[PDB]
Amino acid sequence: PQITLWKRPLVTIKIGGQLKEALLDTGADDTVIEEMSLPGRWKPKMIGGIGGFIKVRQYDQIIIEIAGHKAIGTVLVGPTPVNIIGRNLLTQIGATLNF
């Protein structure tokens, strides 16, 4: 699709068997999802943004379906105020910025 930016670019994602709403976010290096359980090993990480850093759990090799497109990669899980799809998974679905 072609998504205009008059409003937040929100899409439906499926992760760990759950549907969620998430923001397609070109300013995010990494994908960050609100607290949930995911299978396998994880390790602790700090990520920042406006207002400071949060502690998250880093899970690798997680499959997510993003607006119908499957992608695999690292997902960070923690107390983010919004689910964010960052560039690590936007590249895999072939997303580009055009103007």
Ligand X SMILES: COc1ccc(S(=O)(=O)N(CC(C)C)C[C@@H](O)[C@H](Cc2ccccc2)NC(=O)O[C@H]2CO[C@H]3OC[C@H](OC)[C@H]32)cc1
Residues belonging to the active site: 25
74 binds, among Cl ion, ligand X, a copy of itself, none (CB under 5 to 8 A by kind): Cl ion
Q: Does 41 bind a copy of itself (CB under 8 A)?
A: no
d(CA 46, CA 76): 10
The interface partner of residue 40, options being a copy of itself, Na ion, Cl ion, none and the CB cut-off 5 to 8 Å by kind, is: Na ion
Show Cβ contacts of residue 23 under 8 Å, excluding neighbours closer than 6 positions.
8, 9, 10, 82, 83, 84, 85
Q: Which residue's CB is nearer to ligand X, number 12 or number 26?
A: 26
Task: Note whether 89 and 61 are within 8 A (CB).
Answer: no
* x-or-dash string of contact with Na ion, 28-67, rule CB under 5 A: ------------x-------------------xx------
Provide the CB-side half-sphere exposure for 20 (13 A, CA). Answer: 19
For residue 60, give both structure tokens.
């690798």
Positions in the binding site for Cl ion (CB under 5 A) = 4, 73-74, 88
